């Protein structure tokens, strides 16, 4: 319903945030080892702390089996290893979502995730108050010399925002009007950025699917957003990425265990409000990355500007209808090759051909 809280930008990043020595770089290096080579994004500089990972998708893979196309193109998630400090917030402001890593395994100076959640939670809210407060000063200083309604509106929000933060809540979970969000998105505020909780634990805990700290983390999250908790073992994953495909498959069978990195990649990608639509022929099958609540013309623009400027229609078929009926010819036969106009919001998984001029 409401507009999305986050920057109206193409190149979205997710940051690895957490207390020191909980698994941040060990998780990043697993991610890095699975990354796309930086030379394949020639328009971008990929710093050593940055990596981009293919978003795995079973629907995408099925479309590659069907068309057996010449070019298979995936979407990607950009993950940023950050660092806790002050210059910590430079790297943290430049991302659009947080992999909040939390330590849930015993050492071999204390072990507690919910305490670490509070430390970072509080530390995040405080530096947002610091941000809001300064613009609160700058606004009312300028309102002395101007009668601008926008200065008043921005001032009213900044007061309501600081109330929310002092009340012990994150800007992300406020009940904001559409126009408040517009102003909020200018501020790039830390607690406006979405979180995916990654509970790092032993390989034993992970495989057993039980952990002493998990119910205490889980119940806390329900009281603070209800965001996704993915339990994972950083050691197991490190171990598993270091071994080749069939050794991994033998290991996964014999230990009755499986990697959750794909789920982590998928969940992070969705959590920062990205989706994609497919295009699919023998030429290529490609995932077309877009923000949620994107209308069909703006989606078409992402391929070629003309597709938007002279937009006629988007010829869209759902994935479920293609896998069921076996081919596009067959989907057409059943009158399921729909035709959508300029106010059609694109669904994740839509397979689209655009008509224009
Ligand atoms: N599930 C686990 N079991 C055992 N050891 C682990 C597990 N997860 C992480 N570790 C170890 O704990 C350490 C965590 O450090 P690391 O992953 O480098 O975080 P970091 O990047 O140092 N965070 P920061 O200090 O903010 O830079 C590593 O040396 C890991 O080997
Ligand atoms: Cl850094
Ligand atoms: Cl440092
Ligand atoms: Cl097209
Ligand atoms: Mg690190």
| Three-state secondary structure of the chain | CCCCCCCCCCCCEEEEECCCCCCHHHHHHHHHHCCCCHHHCCCCCCCCCEEEEECCCHHHHHHHHHHCCCEEECCEEEEEECCCCCCHHHHHHCCCCEEEEEECCCCCCCCCHHHHHHHHHHHHHHHHHHHHHHHHHHHHHHHCCCCCHHHHHHHHHHHHHHHHHHCCCCHHHCCCCHHHHHHHHHHCCHHHCCEEEEEECCHHHHHHCCCCCHHHHHHHHHCCCCCCEEEECHHHHHHHHHCCHHHHHHHHHHCCCCCCHHHHHHHHHHHCCEEEEEEECCCEEEEEEEECCCEHHHHHHCCCHHHHHCEEEEEEECHHHHHHHCCHHHHHHCCCCEEECCCCECCCCCEEEEEEC
Chain length of the chain: 357
Atom of ligand 1 nearest to the CA of 18: 26
As for how many domains the chain has, the answer is 3
**Scanning the structure block, which residue is given the tokens 């034993």?**
204
Checking the chain for breaks where C and the next N are over 2.5 Å apart, the residues before them are 83, 108
> What CA–CA distance (Å, rounded) separates 122 from 103?
18
d(CA 137, CA 173): 25
With a 6 Å cutoff on the Cβ, whether 207 touches ligand 1 is no
Indicate the residue among 273, 304, 333 that finishes a domain. 273
Same domain assignment for residues 249 and 160: no
Q: What gap in Å lies between CA 331 and CA 316, rounded to an integer? A: 11
User: What span, in angstroms and rounded, lies between the C-alpha atoms of 292 and 350?
Assistant: 13
- Provide the b/e sequence for 156-166 (b: ≥16 CB within 10 Å): ebbeebbebbe
The answer to whether 234 is annotated as binding is: yes
How far is Cα 2 from Cα 324, in angstroms, rounded to an integer?
Answer: 34
Q: Are residues 149 and 290 in the same domain?
A: no
Interior angle at CA 240, CA 40 and CA 251, nearest 5: 135
Instruction: Identify whether residues 204 and 122 lie together within a single domain.
Output: no
Domain co-membership, 69 together with 160: no
Using alpha carbons, select from 229, 341, 352, 194 the residue that is nearest to residue 279. Answer: 352
Q: Residues 181, 230: one domain?
A: no
**186, 166 contact by CB (below 8 A):** no
Let me know whether 294 and 175 are in one domain.
Answer: no
> Can you give the residue range of the structural domain that contains 150?
109-193
Distance 332 CA to ligand 4 centre (A): 17
348: domain CATH number is 3.10.20.30
Q: Which of 162, 193, 224 is the last residue of a domain?
A: 193
> 25 with 92, same domain?
yes
State whether the beta carbon of 26 lies less than 6 angstroms from ligand 1: yes
- Ligand 5 centre and the CA of 86: distance in Å? 16
> Do 295 and 178 belong to one domain?
no
Is 104 in the same domain as 233? yes
| Same-domain check for residues 142 and 254 | no
The whole-angstrom separation of Cα 52 and Cα 64 is 21
What is the experimental method?
A: X-ray
Q: Are residues 124 and 33 in the same domain?
A: no
- 189 and 303 belong to one structural domain: no
């Amino acid at each position: 319903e409401r507009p999305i809280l986050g920057r109206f930008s193409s190149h979205l990043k997710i940051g690895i945030v957490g207390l020191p020595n909980v698994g941040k770089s060990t998780f990043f290096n697993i991610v890095t080892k699975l990354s796309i080579p930086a030379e394949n994004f020639p328009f971008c500089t990929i710093d050593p702390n940055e990596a981009r990972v293919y978003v795995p998708d079973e629907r995408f893979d099925w479309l590659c089996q069907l068309y057996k196309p010449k070019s298979e193109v995936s979407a990607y998630l950009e993950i940023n290893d950050i660092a806790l400090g002050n210059a910590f917030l430079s790297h943290i402001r430049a991302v659009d979502g947080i992999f909040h890593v939390l330590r849930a395994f015993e050492d071999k100076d204390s072990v507690d995730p919910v305490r670490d959640l509070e430390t970072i939670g509080e530390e995040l809210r405080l530096k947002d108050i610091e941000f809001v407060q300064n613009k609160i000063d700058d606004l009312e200083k300028s309102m002395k010399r101007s009668n601008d309604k926008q200065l008043k509106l921005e001032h009213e929000l900044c007061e309501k925002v600081k109330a929310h933060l002092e009340d012990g809540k994150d800007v992300r979970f406020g009940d904001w009007k559409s126009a408040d969000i517009e102003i909020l998105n200018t501020f790039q505020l830390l607690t406006a950025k979405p979180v995916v909780y990654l509970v790092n634990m032993s390989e034993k805990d992970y495989q057993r699917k039980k952990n002493k700290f998990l119910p205490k983390i889980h119940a806390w999250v329900q009281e603070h957003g209800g965001e996704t908790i993915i339990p994972f073992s950083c050691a197991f994953e490190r171990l598993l990425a270091d071994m080749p495909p069939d050794e991994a498959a033998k290991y996964c069978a014999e230990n009755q265990i499986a990697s959750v990195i794909p789920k982590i990649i998928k969940t992070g990608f969705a959590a920062i409000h990205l989706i994609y639509f497919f295009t699919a022929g023998p030429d290529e099958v490609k995932c077309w990355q877009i923000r949620r609540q994107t209308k069909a013309p703006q989606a078409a623009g992402t391929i070629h500007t003309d597709f938007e400027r002279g937009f006629i229609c988007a010829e869209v078929m759902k994935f479920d209808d293609l896998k069921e009926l076996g081919s596009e010819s067959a989907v057409k036969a059943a009158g399921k090759y729909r035709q959508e106009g300029k106010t059609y919001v694109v669904q994740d998984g839509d397979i689209i051909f655009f008509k224009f001029n």
